[PDB]
Subunit: 245 residues, 3 copies
């Protein structure tokens, strides 16, 4: 239901109900939560890559039969990952499927992938963080339209809006996604984690508080081995070798 697989410091997670377009059930949420918590705790894992099996990323909640609490746990786990997350959207992302996709720090879609909010078509509001992420990602103007009218957006339109950072031919998506994940897995994991904490908080903070948090987290980044390594690397005009500590 969630396939796992490690590779050069990258934990690859695959949503696996392909015949139902990876539609989301309680069980899948429970398994997804577990994989994410495992990936967080495993120190050998320095990057995650999330994708779907088959033709789709995920068509969202399975409309074949508490549940809210389950989604929320996954989102707290996705958002709080102290490790870069790459998302490879290999096909349709609808409803909470789109929500999950959008939690990637770096996001790639296949030519032929698509995105639809879908919630409103079922008389529901956006969940799994979409009301949070979407206006931040594409701006309020596009958020309003995408949410209220629920159009189906193509990969190329998703790229233009900032829903994804790169579009790639289907057969190359995993190769590029994994290649990016591997590179991130070599990079300064602590700097990544703390930069993400700043981005997650930025909009609700006053400048004063933003400056204070930057100070505190810069303080911590400053005492990592990776920063020592980083400065040394720059001085001795060579690439750094980061360990994530």
């Amino acid at each position: 239901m969630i396939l796992k697989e490690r590779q050069d410091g990258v934990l690859v997670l695959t949503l696996n109900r392909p015949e139902k377009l990876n539609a989301i059930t309680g069980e899948l949420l429970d398994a997804l939560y577990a994989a994410l918590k495992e990936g967080e705790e495993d120190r050998e894992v320095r990057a995650l890559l999330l994708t779907g099996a088959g033709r789709a990323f995920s068509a969202g909640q399975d409309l074949t039969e508490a549940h809210l609490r389950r989604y929320n746990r996954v989102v707290e786990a996705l958002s709080g990952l102290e490790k870069p997350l790459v998302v490879a959207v290999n096909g349709v992302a609808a409803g909470a499927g789109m929500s999950l996709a959008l939690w990637g720090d770096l996001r790639l879609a296949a030519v032929g992938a698509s995105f639809t909010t879908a919630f409103v078509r079922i008389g529901l509001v956006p969940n799994s963080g979409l009301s949070f992420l979407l206006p931040r990602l594409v701006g309020l103007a596009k958020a309003q339209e995408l949410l209220l009218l629920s159009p189906r957006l193509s990969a190329e339109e998703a790229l233009a809006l900032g829903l994804v950072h790169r579009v790639v031919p289907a057969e190359k998506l995993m190769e590029e996604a994994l290649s990016l994940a591997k590179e991130l897995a070599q990079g300064p994991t602590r700097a990544y984690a703390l930069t993400k904490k700043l981005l997650l908080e930025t909009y609700r903070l006053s400048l004063t508080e933003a400056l204070a948090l930057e100070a505190v987290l810069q303080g911590q980044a400053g005492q990592t081995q990776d920063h020592e390594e980083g400065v040394r690397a720059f001085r001795e005009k060579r690439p750094p070798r980061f360990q994530g500590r």
Copy 2:
């Protein structure tokens, strides 16, 4: 001063001081407030459509006319509508005229319509929610330029920035706007209303609080007839028929 008219669940409100380009006065604000309160309370109204009479949408505050509290009341009523609002910008929107236009959830402009913040040219700051809406809609970088330099944007540029969602020839604007409003008036009114409550709050909330509010409001959407209808519709591969409750 504010024309009203119902049609298939849509309340159409027209700013009507056309010879003064629908420039805004205390009286017009008072009439607008009343129409909006009525529209909110009327259960047979499932969508609103706001437009201007004549050449212009609105040239903003009438410069030939405490008072700020009056604008604010109208904005609380505009923004808090528990019903999709369509805006059809039939000509120039300047100052609080632009503020009002931008409160549409879905916004259409006529080909020769135009937008100017105007405020700074009169030595004023933005009002009527523009300092709120604009940076959210188009991002801080464009907000700074639009506000501090007050250029005049065309319909096509407004479309590119997300200030409007669709551009249409003048003579077709009302037909398309009303047609959109009628379609929204058939859709899940509660889902629309609650989505808007989430969008209004999103930027000041931490992820944790955002997830909590999504849960509460999803809880309520979940107990509407429209959601039952929504799920049933998907199962029995047919279009849903929503009532807004």
Copy 3:
């Protein structure tokens, strides 16, 4: 280390360690703070223009040179300037160099200028307000990519993202920047200042609080000579002449 120079109500500040690409040291920060405080207090100054000497704007923290409180003081002073700030990016802006550049209310880059977040390359998080400004300026999607991958962006890409408002040939940059600064120096300084206070706060405020602050600050703008002048100018179809009070 910081060159100063007045001209038609514009204070021009130049970062001057050109041989080290205007890399930032404690001393430079202290000198920059002083110049900014002076510019703030001088009533004859109605605009600032910040630039770099030589090939670069600033390559960020000098890696040859807790300390965060020093940067923060400068940022509080930059952000709280009650006067439009123009920034002319004449060459590379990296790390806190990019942070400082982005505090411009209006920003110009030379053809040939470039931008790099840089922080993550040395295993650090963004500072000097970049985690605050960047997501606001270009949206969260681009912020994620710019910060985590630290690409070097060209002037034209920076323009497309909103990092700068205008790109100009190198030999004309100062002429255009100063010309813009001079125009702003003739405009309604108080309206500028108060608009900036609204923009700085907007994201963490509820609509209700945003409307209240607009009322309070509009109240103040309303009692300036410049507003009287502004209204008078519109009535007597002529350009206003503003004094900034």
